[PDB]
Design a protein around this ligand. Structure first.
Ligand SMILES: [Zn+2]
Lengths: 92, 489, 84, 654, 77
């Protein structure tokens, strides 16, 4: 039945988030981050939007998603990723 | 066809005034009789196009514009002059040097304005179709009526001009009903072959595919060129075969395959005469010559006078001595070069190759069989016999081969028991090898052993093991700099 | 094969067909004048016992490869063998 | 045939009397064509239909029965113009290109067969030329009838009448006049209308003066008749082709492709105006990557690559080469694989092959035989740029070929009856993919490619890279993804970036060709001694660095590289002579390259030693398989780990 | 100048594997998946020429027992 959709207005934040993830992650570990890995955020988010039966994308969904993908990326990296963890707080 | 007669009487005059060709025909007629008195030469007289313009422009423009009507009367005239020569105890061939051209074309630019007109193609030759006989003159013997009976077979490439096809098989009871046995070995067979020619790879315009056309090589020309050789063919440009139009429905558009007959095949990229040998003779007495010679190898390479000296001493190589009823001692000298990269070790070897008079180059792996015959169902070192084999990255080569190289080098022979043909065949080649140090640049400081990396007997087999260092110095550096600079100008 | 004289039926005799070149075309009709036209054409078959057989063995020979120049390729030559 | 007289009279009256106010366009089209020896005519249908509606009414009715009466009609005119009497003059080909209405490829189904059809598609490959016939003599095998057959267009069997029979007629090839033919095969354009299916390709026969008019891969608009041929492959099932009269390429397209060593004057003018820019180098370095952000060393390196270098034929036969090599190797997001597509676009003659070769194309010079040079990257790309990817992933046998090729520029093929040594003047630009990521930097800088650094030794400029987005980059790409919809604003912005984006890059190409052919640079002496000091400081200092056996290099080949950069950049300024500052850039650029050259415990696994000793003096029955059984159930050994410790001990000398 | 009628569903509804001689010359519905199809090659159909016999229809599908001037082709597949 349902096909949730994001609204362009307030979601620009995501872009910032990407940057916040991207550069700071380049100092340690390779690569893996890429714009693909951005897109997965959005898609997963709208999956949660389906579980909410929400008809549109919301900030909660984003929170959930970002936690999912970001912790996914964290846990792949070498033990140096412990150093990563300390900046995850604001992402948390 | 009195005009064909005109062509013959016209070409007659060209010869004997001026007479500059006639001496060569005489030379051909004499040399073979000298072989008759002994205890091979193709019969054809190279005609420089250079000379043709001085006499008649009318007949000059013809050979290029319409060679079918001209080359054969000129040819019949050449035979006619060869028979008036001396004396008794064959069609020949024209050649056409040139004085090109018009008609200058690479194979990429050709078809059709250049068709049915003399042409000098040039390009790479591949894949060189395999040499095969071709029947021409039929010869038979009747009995008991006797006499001597012959038929003449006209193929597609017979003469030049098109003629009603004679083929095929044998006349077999020409009237009256007398039996005719084929007489083999009186009857004439001209060898025949075709080789396709691709345009030069370096003048190719774009990723657009190469366009090759095929050249039939008559008589002597056969087996004159291996495939992959720079070749400038000449010949008349012939379109043979129906386009399918002969048979009534062949509906496809494709048609009239074209090829070039003959003709010359000048390759492109020893004779000491009177004067040269004198130069040597004069130069032999001078006491210092060896050093000059040794310097003559290296326009582009510093120092290494000792190594250059070596390469000469390989080029010459200690005669060869085969004892009575006993083994022979190895004549030639083998060399190895080991040092850090930039040592020109791979650069030196090509210059070895060029002036070497032979031989084949081999780089690392390389192989299969290297020098072997491989016993083909159903190599280099052999083919390189009396020559200089190069080996690059001599270390990289699999030990399996090295095992054979032991047999090649000192023992001087190769032995093949494989399946098979079982024979001991001779490869007596001289050998050079350049091989990287074990690991990195470490050669210089590293121990007299453990540095070479390829024990053991090999180290011995090589007559000379030369080591060269890339270690750096500022003075030597400057002295490098200037020569490098001047080299590019 | 060399001759291979086929055998006729009615009036017999013999005829010998020459084996020339590689192959030959077999014939039937009747060559014999007796079986011929009366009546009508006698039938004839080849008799294997009567034929003269010559052993035949073919083999190709590649060059020794030392006789090969710096270039090209080993070229085999086909060789027919007969009799002893 | 008084009707053919009636038609041809109308065609003559169409050529001689036609007036565009006031020159006669056709009549002069004719003269100006016979003089250059073009022997062709191009009719503009709009003028035709303007002149008489009638003759176009018949010409769109039965074209193939008429058009040749138009050919003979026009050549009968060139007889009265080009010459005068009281030979030989071939019957000219007419090429007619007109607007009409474009009929897409999918929409050709019967019903218009033998009616002129204008259409549009991208040519796939051009077939090798072959001759048809025009005028050929024929003699009989028996009565010897001499018949001159004028074959026309647009198959045709020979006449059997002067037993005699059935078809006793021989083609005399000594007198027969021949023309040429092409066979284009064209795939309809990818924009429309593929839908979900692979696009169809109609086979086309160009002939005479349209032949070799079009490089395969260029969009065109064909005109031609539509018609069918048999070609047994029932029942009856005849297959479709398009005869072409005549072809017209899309705008322009002459000049490029079709760019000869010659060009117009004003190009020299504006070039020589560009040579006067102080920022010339600096503005060029801004042309290459409008899209690609940063990576300035690479960005400049491309420039100095394209421009070639010192090339020396000096005796003896040895010839030094240009120009250099470039390695983009690094983790993805480097855009290097895109950057190569760009170089491929700019460079005058370029071939992008990422392989292994692909797909059908071999990567190197290869001998293949004509069933009745096979091609590859190098050969087809000769005298210019070659772009390679996955350079570590390439096959062995041709890897040899490459590493022998890049230095001496010539591939040497001894296979079978052809021993030829053929030329590759190409300069390889390779982007390798490094393994395991950042740790390979923690690892020795070399040792990456296979087991051997020799590759990296051959290569002049090696740039392992980083795309550190200046905070404005990652936001650039991100923001770009967010939108990517309406209203084409961004695409526009790209386009004005293209206008302003320094050299239009369509111009840059022509420029590169220019500089490449015109002038060959040469270095100055003080620059030379400068570089001597350079290289001896390099050798000395870095030796001192390697006193500790610091694991990494220096070859005189590298020096030669530095040289080729200096000449390249000298050839930018177009000057016949080098300068010191001019090199002063190069030293530091290559210095950045040197900086690029610089960047279960190992010792424990590095043992293997305990195995080599008191385990196996032979080594055999030990092999990698043994260390595998020894290090399989010991909770311990990785592939790189096992090799590393092995290579280590191999080098270490243990 | 010709319109051949399409004639919608006609059960029957024989599937594929069930077919016999009894179905010859008689219209029968069939169903199933398509497998890769030949390209579109115009069939001869009608024959016409300027003279010079008359128009000859051939065929489906024999063609026994060629001229051409303006012939009406129809696509075959
Ligand atoms: Zn009998």
């Amino acid at each position: 039945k349902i096909y949730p959709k994001l609204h362009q207005m307030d979601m620009d934040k995501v872009s910032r988030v990407y940057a916040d993830l991207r550069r700071e992650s380049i100092s340690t570990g390779s690569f893996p981050i890429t714009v693909r890995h951005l897109e997965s955020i959005l898609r997963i988010a709208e999956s949660f939007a389906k579980m909410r039966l929400s008809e549109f994308v919301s900030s909660y969904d984003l929170d959930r998603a970002i936690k999912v993908v970001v912790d996914s990326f964290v846990d792949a990296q070498k033990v140096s990723v412990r150093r990563q963890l300390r900046r995850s707080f604001a992402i948390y | 066809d009195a005009v064909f007669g005109d062509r013959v009487r016209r070409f007659q005059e060209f010869l004997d005034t001026f007479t500059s060709y006639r001496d060569s025909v005489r030379s051909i007629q004499v040399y073979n009789s000298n072989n008759a008195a002994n205890y091979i030469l193709p019969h054809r007289i190279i005609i420089s196009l250079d000379d043709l313009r001085e006499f008649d422009r009318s007949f000059w423009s013809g050979i290029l514009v319409e060679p079918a009507y001209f080359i054969p009367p000129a040819e019949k005239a050449l035979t006619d002059l060869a028979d008036s020569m001396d004396d008794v105890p064959h069609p020949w061939k024209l050649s056409f040097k040139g004085s090109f051209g018009a008609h200058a074309l690479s194979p990429r630019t050709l078809t059709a304005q250049h068709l049915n007109k003399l042409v000098s193609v040039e390009g790479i030759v591949t894949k060189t179709s395999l040499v095969r006989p071709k029947l021409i003159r039929s010869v038979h013997y009747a009995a008991k009526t006797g006499r001597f009976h012959y038929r003449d077979y006209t193929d597609a490439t017979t003469t030049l001009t098109t003629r009603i096809p004679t083929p095929a098989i044998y006349p077999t009871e020409d009237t009256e009903g007398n039996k005719l046995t084929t007489e083999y070995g009186y009857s004439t067979f001209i060898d025949h072959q075709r080789i396709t020619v691709q345009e030069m790879p370096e003048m190719a315009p774009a990723g657009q595919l190469p366009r090759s056309i095929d050249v039939i090589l008559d008589d002597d020309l056969v087996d004159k060129t291996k495939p992959g050789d720079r070749v400038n063919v000449v010949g008349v440009f012939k379109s043979l075969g129906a386009g399918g139009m002969n048979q009534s429905n062949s509906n496809t558009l494709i048609g009239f395959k074209t090829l070039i007959l003959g003709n010359t095949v000048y390759p492109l990229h020893q004779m000491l005469t009177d004067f040269d040998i004198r130069n040597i003779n004069k130069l032999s007495k001078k006491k210092d010559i060896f050093d000059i010679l040794s310097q003559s190898l290296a326009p582009s390479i510093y120092g290494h006078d000792h190594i250059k000296k070596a390469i000469l001493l390989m080029l010459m190589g200690g005669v060869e001595k085969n004892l009575e009823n006993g083994s022979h001692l190895r004549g030639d000298i083998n060399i190895l070069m080991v040092g850090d990269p930039s040592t020109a070790k791979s650069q030196l070897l090509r210059f070895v190759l060029n002036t070497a008079s032979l031989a084949i180059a081999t780089t690392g792996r390389g192989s299969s069989g290297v020098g072997l015959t491989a016993a083909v169902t159903t190599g280099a070192m052999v083919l390189a016999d009396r020559g200089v084999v190069c080996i690059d990255e001599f270390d990289k080569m699999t030990d399996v081969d090295r095992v054979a190289i032991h047999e090649v080098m000192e023992q001087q022979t190769v032995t093949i028991a494989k399946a098979g043909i079982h024979t001991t065949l001779n490869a007596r080649c001289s050998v050079i090898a350049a091989a990287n140090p074990v690991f990195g640049q470490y050669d210089v400081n590293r121990d007299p052993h453990q540095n070479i990396a390829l024990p053991d007997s090999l180290l011995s087999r090589f007559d000379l093991l030369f080591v060269v260092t890339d270690d750096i110095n500022e003075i030597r550096d400057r002295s490098i700099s200037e020569h490098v600079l001047r080299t590019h100008r | 094969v060399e001759v291979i004289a086929y055998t006729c039926d009615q009036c017999g005799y013999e005829v010998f067909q020459e084996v020339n070149s590689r192959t030959f075309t077999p014939l039937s009709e009747c060559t014999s004048e007796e079986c011929s036209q009366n009546q009508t054409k006698g039938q004839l078959f080849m008799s294997t016992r009567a034929s003269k057989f010559s052993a035949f063995q073919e083999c190709k020979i590649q060059e020794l490869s030392q006789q090969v120049p710096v270039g090209h390729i080993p070229r085999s030559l086909n060789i027919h063998v007969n009799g002893t | 045939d008084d009707d053919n007289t009636e038609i041809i009279k109308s065609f003559k009256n169409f050529i001689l009397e036609f007036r565009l106010d006031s020159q006669f366009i056709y009549r002069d089209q004719l003269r100006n064509n016979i003089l250059v020896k073009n022997y062709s005519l191009t009719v503009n249908m709009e003028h035709l239909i303007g002149y008489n509606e009638d003759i176009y009414k018949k010409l769109s009715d039965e074209p193939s029965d008429i058009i040749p009466l138009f050919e003979t009609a026009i050549t009968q005119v060139a007889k009265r113009i080009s010459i005068l009497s009281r030979n030989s003059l071939p019957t000219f080909q007419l090429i007619l290109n007109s607007n009409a209405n474009q009929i897409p490829l999918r929409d050709l189904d019967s019903e218009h067969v033998s009616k002129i059809v204008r259409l549009s598609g991208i040519i796939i490959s051009t077939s090798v030329l072959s001759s048809r016939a025009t005028y050929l003599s024929i003699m009989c095998r028996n009565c010897r009838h001499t018949t001159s057959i004028t074959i026309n267009n647009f198959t045709v069997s020979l006449p059997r009448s002067c037993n005699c029979g059935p078809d006793p007629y021989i083609i005399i090839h000594e007198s027969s006049k021949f023309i040429d033919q092409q066979f284009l095969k064209l795939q309809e354009i990818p924009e429309l209308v593929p839908v979900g299916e692979m696009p169809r390709n109609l086979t086309m026969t160009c002939d005479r003066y349209l032949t070799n008019k079009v490089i395969p891969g260029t969009r065109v608009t064909i005109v031609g008749i539509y018609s069918i041929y048999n070609s047994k492959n029932g029942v009856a099932i005849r297959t479709p082709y398009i005869k072409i009269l005549g072809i017209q390429s899309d705008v322009e397209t002459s000049s490029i492709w079709n760019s000869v060593t010659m060009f117009t004057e004003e190009e020299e003018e504006e070039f020589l105006q560009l040579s006067r820019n102080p920022k010339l180098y600096e503005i060029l370095t801004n042309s290459i990557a409008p899209s690609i952000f940063g990576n300035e060393d690479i960005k400049k390196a491309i420039v100095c690559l394209l421009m070639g270098g010192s090339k020396k034929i000096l005796p003896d036969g040895m010839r030094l080469r240009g120009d250099i090599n470039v390695l983009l190797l690094g983790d993805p997001g480097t855009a290097k694989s895109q950057l190569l597509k760009f170089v491929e676009k700019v460079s005058p003659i370029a071939v992008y092959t990422s392989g292994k070769g692909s797909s059908a194309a071999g990567l190197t010079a290869s001998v293949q035989r004509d069933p009745m040079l096979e091609g590859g990257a190098m050969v087809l790309a000769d005298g210019g740029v070659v772009c390679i990817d996955e350079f570590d992933k390439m096959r062995d046998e041709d890897r040899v070929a490459i590493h022998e090729a890049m230095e001496q520029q010539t591939i040497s093929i001894a296979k079978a009856g052809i021993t030829t040594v053929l030329n590759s003047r190409t300069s390889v630009l390779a982007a390798a993919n490094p393994i395991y990521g950042r740790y390979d930097d923690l690892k020795s800088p070399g040792d990456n490619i296979d087991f051997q650094t020799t590759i990296l030794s051959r290569f002049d400029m090696i740039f392992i890279v980083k795309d550190d987005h200046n905070e404005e980059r990652d936001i650039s790409i991100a923001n770009h993804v967010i939108n990517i919809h309406t209203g084409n604003a961004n695409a526009m912005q790209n386009q004005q970036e293209e206008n302003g984006s320094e050299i239009s890059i369509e111009k840059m190409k022509r420029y590169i060709t220019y500089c490449r052919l015109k002038c060959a640079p040469r270095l100055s002496p003080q620059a030379a001694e400068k570089l001597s000091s350079n290289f001896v400081t390099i050798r000395k200092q870095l030796l001192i660095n390697e006193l500790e056996s610091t694991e990494r290099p220096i070859t005189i080949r590298q020096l030669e590289a530095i040289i080729r950069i200096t000449e390249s950049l000298a050839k930018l300024e177009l000057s016949p002579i080098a300068q010191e500052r001019h090199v002063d850039e190069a030293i530091r650029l290559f210095q950045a390259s040197t900086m690029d050259a610089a960047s279960t415990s190992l010792s424990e696994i590095r043992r293997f030693e305990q195995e080599l000793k008191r385990r196996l003096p032979i080594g055999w029955s030990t092999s990698y398989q043994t260390l595998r059984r020894e290090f399989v159930d010991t909770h311990r050994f990785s592939q790189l780990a096992l090799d590393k410790a092995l290579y280590a001990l191999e080098k270490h000398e243990t | 100048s010709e319109i051949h009628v399409r004639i919608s569903d006609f059960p029957t509804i024989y599937s594929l594997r069930e077919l016999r001689e009894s179905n010859l010359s008689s219209l029968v519905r069939v169903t199933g998946v398509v497998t890769r199809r030949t390209g579109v090659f115009p069939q001869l159909k009608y024959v016409k020429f300027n003279c010079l016999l008359g128009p000859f229809f051939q065929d489906s599908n024999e063609e026994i027992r060629v001229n051409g001037e303006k012939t009406v082709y129809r696509n075959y597949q």
